[model samples]
Target: GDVEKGKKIFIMKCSQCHTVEKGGKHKTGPNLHGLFGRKTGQAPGYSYTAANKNKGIIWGEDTLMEYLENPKKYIPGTKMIFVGIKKKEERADLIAYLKKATNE
Candidate 1:
């Protein structure tokens, strides 16, 4: 997992909707700080769909990889609109980036 490449991927595809910086403000998507180990739809101020809120998922490398590959497929009725990352390496890199960038 290349953290640098993941940062670029986030900037190009995810930055518009999500923010990974700790305490960062929410955008179209919820702020993603502290994302690892958290449950789905748990970001403080975001309004999540019932499907997401009820998913009861714990975020981890494997779960994040599966979800990033296909959000809708992983969590049906999710509000995310982005087409998922299709490249396995890119998804791995993105999760690696998030693990560091979203945590203290």
Candidate 2:
């Protein structure tokens, strides 16, 4: 849950496709500025897979933890291509960073 370390993880693992700043433009992946508490596939202007649009997931710490562990496995048919973070603590750190960045 270290924000600094989490930022590092985000830069290494997520920055290529996702943006955390408010009003950030959608890239290959959706912008993740307001990710917390959002429903799956709800990002404006981004087309999502049927699996993502139909999954009806509520984004939160628990859900995020699971999703980040395995994107396609968690929601079959998802288009996200990155392999998930495997280490437990690292996931927590990523979530920690996301919680702060997306909220701000």
Candidate 3:
């Protein structure tokens, strides 16, 4: 997985609010540097929405794939405001990129 593609997508679409590097501060959302195997709402100092809290969403390939398909549907009321990607290959590629970024 080429993390570069994921970085491009994230910067273009999600970087306005979220960060994807280590030690990055919370913008409107949490940093996703080490998100590959993490649990949702676990980022430090980031205030999670009620919908995300206690949801126990594990951030893995499958979970990310599903979430990228439809964020609201995957976890209703999630603070993520952007619509999900509709393309299957794009989503998979993005997940692959994310996995690479996380070194998972």
Candidate 4:
């Protein structure tokens, strides 16, 4: 699936805390608008874990897939506590959704 499907999934699962629109504000987590191609832990006004800062990940399909496969393994101090999506297709779909939402 692509970004449209991912958008549906995100609405069901992630919209509770994140927004993908420009000028969106932080909620429980940081606003996810324009997240693609961004550096990890770069969202303004949001506190980041040292591990996320140290990992120096750039948001892209590969980096996101790695992180989604295992958050702690990808970034030891990341604040995201949820277990990642295990299925490759699902993860891809999620990324697709994010890309569309963020217009990246």
Models 1 onward score TM values of: 0.81, 0.84, 0.78, 0.80
**Per-residue lDDT of model 4, residues 1-104, tens digit only:** 86567878777766766666535677565677876866767656778555766767776778777776787787777676765675777777787778766754
Model 1 lDDT-worst window of ten:
43-52
Residue 5 deviation, candidate 2, in Å? 1.6
Which of 1 and 2 is the better model by lDDT? 2
User: Which order, best to worst by lDDT?
Assistant: 2, 1, 4, 3
Candidate 2 shows a clash count of: 0
**What lDDT does the true structure give each of the candidates?**
0.72, 0.76, 0.69, 0.70
lDDT of 3 by residue, 1-104 (tens): 35677668666666676677635677687677777776777756766655655677777887777766777887787777777576676666666766776756
- Sliding window of 10 residues with minimal summed lDDT for model 3: 43-52
Clashes of 3: 0
Clashing pairs in 3: none
Candidate 2, after superposition: displacement of residue 65 in Å?
1.4
List the candidate 1 regions with Cα displacement exceeding 4 Å.
none
lDDT of 2 by residue, 11-104 (tens): 7888778866525687677777777877767756777555766878877889878877788888898677888576887887888888786765
TM-score of 2: 0.84
Candidate 2 residue 66 Cα shift, in angstroms, is 1.4
RMSD of each: 2.2, 2.0, 2.3, 2.2
